[PDB]
Design a binder for these strands. Sequence first.
RNA 1: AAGAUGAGACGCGUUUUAGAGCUAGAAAUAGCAAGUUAAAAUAAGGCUAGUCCGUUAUCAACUUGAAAAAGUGGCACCGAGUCGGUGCUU
DNA 2: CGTGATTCCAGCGTCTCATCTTATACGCAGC
DNA 3: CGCTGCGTATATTGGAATCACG
Length: 1188
Amino acid sequence: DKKYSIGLAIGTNSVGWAVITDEYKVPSKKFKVLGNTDRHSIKKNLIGALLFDSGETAEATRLKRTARRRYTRRKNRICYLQEIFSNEMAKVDDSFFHRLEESFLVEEDKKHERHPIFGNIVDEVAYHEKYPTIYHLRKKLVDSTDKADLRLIYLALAHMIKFRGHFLIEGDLNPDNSDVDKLFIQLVQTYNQLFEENPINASGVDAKAILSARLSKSRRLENLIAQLPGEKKNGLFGNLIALSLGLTPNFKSNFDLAEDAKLQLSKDTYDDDLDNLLAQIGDQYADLFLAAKNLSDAILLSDILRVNTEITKAPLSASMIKRYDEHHQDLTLLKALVRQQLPEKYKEIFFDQSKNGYAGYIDGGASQEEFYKFIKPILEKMDGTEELLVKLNREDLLRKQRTFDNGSIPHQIHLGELHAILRRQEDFYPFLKDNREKIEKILTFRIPYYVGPLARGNSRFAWMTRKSEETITPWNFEEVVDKGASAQSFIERMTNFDKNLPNEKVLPKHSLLYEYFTVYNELTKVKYVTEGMRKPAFLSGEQKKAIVDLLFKTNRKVTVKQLKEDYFKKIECFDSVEISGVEDRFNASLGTYHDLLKIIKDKDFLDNEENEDILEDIVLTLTLFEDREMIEERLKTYAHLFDDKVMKQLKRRRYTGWGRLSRKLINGIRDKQSGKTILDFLKSDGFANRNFMQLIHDDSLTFKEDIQKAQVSLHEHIANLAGSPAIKKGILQTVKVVDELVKVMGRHKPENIVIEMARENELDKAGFIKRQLVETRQITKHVAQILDSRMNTKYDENDKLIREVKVITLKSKLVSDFRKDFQFYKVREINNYHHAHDAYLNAVVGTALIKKYPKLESEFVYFFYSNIMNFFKTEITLANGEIRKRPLIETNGETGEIVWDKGRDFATVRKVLSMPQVNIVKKTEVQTGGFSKESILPKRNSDKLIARKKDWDPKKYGGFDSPTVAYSVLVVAKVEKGKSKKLKSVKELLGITIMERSSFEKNPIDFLEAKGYKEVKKDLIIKLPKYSLFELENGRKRMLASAGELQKGNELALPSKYVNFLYLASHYESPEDNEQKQLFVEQHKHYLDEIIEQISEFSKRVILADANLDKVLSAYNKHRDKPIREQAENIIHLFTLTNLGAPAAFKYFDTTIDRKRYTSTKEVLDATLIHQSITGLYETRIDLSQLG
RNA sequence: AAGAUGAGACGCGUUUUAGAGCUAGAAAUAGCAAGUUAAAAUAAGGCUAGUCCGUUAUCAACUUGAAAAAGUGGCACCGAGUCGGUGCUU
DNA sequence: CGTGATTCCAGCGTCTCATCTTATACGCAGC
DNA sequence: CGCTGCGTATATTGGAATCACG
């Protein structure tokens, strides 16, 4: 048997594989070909590449799922509101809700009157006259006190609930506090009263302009400070301003506090932080802060709301109505001005829905920005146009009610408006008064981000824990959903498990047990050297306890000097002691211990072991939750041990982060023979003081065996890796390709497996060698480990894996240098063979390296310089112009095996690179994704429209188009051809769309009979996924891009000379070498027309693009006078014409050639279909012309 | 510092319908109006009936296994336009 | 009256939170 | 030995429509 090696090159969209025997020669083997064709054996080289579409992140799918949930919940909220309105609306208007529901149907299909709101034309007209927009209805309901019809109330409430704005501001906003300057003046006055010693000159400073400017918070703060030379941005007044702006000021400095007084108004915890300020400095500032809070409100209302507050308590409705009136006035003025001045453009602006005029801005498709762009030169051309220009410069001209920039509106405004409306109308409708709280809750309720979807055990994203078997409505959310359990699971389901105990769960970062473990583990390897000691000795358990009590339990940090003085000098009376294993200070510290000692003020409580679990239940509680209410609820169980002040301090205290070792791995498991745990051993390990690594790697202790036993699917193992989904797909395809290759070579595993991943998108000499050899990226290490585990499964009796297969890792830079140094150039656009070529080179390089320098295996699985690939060079430069020669045959001195034959290896490499047949295979994959193009098309008399619902005929209501076909199906059956319904046998591809895929797979016979096919041969059905391969004739092979489109599937085996000439001429990436290359470029410029001739021949044989090829030839003849480099680059562009895959347009100089599309699939019905294996070696050819 | 994964939310957009378009012109076609908004859906859909799930990952062919997956393909040499030819076994 | 050429077009803009993970250095400890 | 950890620092391509057009 011939032992071989496998080279692999992974990439986002390609996986190159190569099999090399000795002398670095790709074998050529005959493979049997199945099918009903006539061939029985085909020759194939053992090198190739696999092509596939890059993997997609779940980001888009997650966004779509979230949108689905949001729409579902919105509809549920509407349903709740209607249910509240059910009986009363039925008393008032029996079918009002029904008219609301069928509003989308056309008049033919409506079961009620076409007017939803009133069910009659006259009332609808009158209503539309009275309230031009819904905001008029809202303003009327808020302001008027007269009893209103329940339908209008429902419409206003539904408009509020359905569109409620964001929840980025919590608490009460007090929208009446809209005084941008008066509140500022009041705050300044209060500050001056509290700081009469340091008054502030607020005169001459416009608070409104600075604070309501459409700029960043920092910029406006700096602008305000600039007008106050005596005050700074970091000053107390400056920090109050920053807090009003929504920043995070640090009051610790201004108030000289030890606690970091970080306060932000938006945060729910703000009030509690204010309470902290109510416990350190005093209450005199409270009103001050309140004023600042009020100031903040005005700022938040400044940009969103531009209206007087005294006129009404619904500022949003007033602002919308004012904007509508401004729009109306500007529209009337603009119409008058256009008719007076430019009557010709009047039709273009007020009638052309296709243009970007007002007709297109309203009725057609045109944004506000687009409309402004269209209209601005028109307004400048006209005269008497100043107000409109000012508004356009302000982006406040002809604005609509429902614009894109309404997302800044806090839900508090809607809540206040709804509350006001309910209060106004509660005197007329008892149920509104009774269910006011319910509607307020519906408006203000959210599913908390830490609860997750309210599933019932049917979801792969859900962790919500219930309490009772009922329906989670917003009014009984707390009664049903267990907030504590759900919030704990929301953290636990995504936390890393212990590496040594995969079933167990890691401990928090600041656990007292974890800190103790770190302290003891660091203390175990501590040695002390004194005069009376011959040899340094480890610290005894009693000594360790004494040190911890003296230092670790008394100071937030422990230093080397503190250890030397406070223990050896004080207790041991050691005046000279040296400590090894630690420098500077000690990284481990009892930060949690000192913090809890500060808070609860009971050292004995901490020192009691019986409290340990409780202590853990505190720290975990201080890590699981971020809401202070949840933390308080959890700590209420332990509120009996500590005073309310301690409870408040604990609620304030909240640290995050998680450790890396579980509790069972520290204090859970106990050694069988000794009866001691890991913590027990760390507290007393005799005199050896074995640390955690020694304890877990000790063959004499049960811990290692327990770890091994507890430590006991390729796809799942890959899905848990860290990397982009495309790279993970590439890794999986690489592994399956390795499996296929092993099956190919007679099930004899290769000696070496070199792996290189392209890209995401004396001691010094030894270090440089290590840098050039090791692969810094860890995903490469993961892939190498996976391949080593899969290929190697022979662990000897000494508990060591027999390395029958050596996984090597290599970096792209070395191979690229090899290519560019030995003129083994590549062009990305010519063809895909480079992928396989790269793999081959990788294998060769790797193999040669492991042959030449076996001792370096540990670096990636001798000389005086740091170079490692230099021995391939036939001639070596000594960096001083002293060109010398290496031995012609390079061999390892110790072994004596020949590792490089310059007289044969270079020629063999050239031949392998020049081999015309390369196993390029496009990974056939059933396509999935959106059912079609999402854009909803208007009703047309076309059959390509796709229904958006069951009863919505696309001829009337419009719908989707351009469906995506997953895989085609070749059907041989009969149809009712002609008027006589003659059953003519037919053979054509039928497109299986993603929408219809399930129906077809459930019952193909009925699905095919539904589309008009009769007498279907069930066994003759052949499934052709996307990129299925067909051979028509004369070697013309095409990939089935869809049910009705083909792709070029043949590659151009360009001679290496042409490739090198193209690389050198175009400057794709030693002056004498450059001059020689230029001379060769000119010499092959004499040959340049040969490249064009080869392109034309390949196009005639396989492409059949007559018009495009003729235009290419004409343009080339026209541009023959162009410089050689320009022509070379343009021909590199020309390579797009014949490159594999979907045809693409290109540009030869100034002539643009569009893509030729093979839109007919009639020919492949009589061609030979090919099933290429994963590596493409095992091929199954079926002659489709023998069917039918 | 960067990137990935998941959860909770907003604002649009896009379609059909509701916004009586008026005058004259046999009709077609011109002139004159208005235009800002609202409802429903926003993947068809499924049952596992939940404020659940539906665009990520997986997938050559034949047999088996629900399916994850398992089984299924001789070697050497010469050359190379997509792989051919020659010798042994079969 | 089908058929090759030519052209048009595709849902999108934010916010909050959590879990991470890498990415590379440094120091300590090791079986 | 190489790993094991502990800590610190931060556009594209298929569909679809239309247009000569023999």
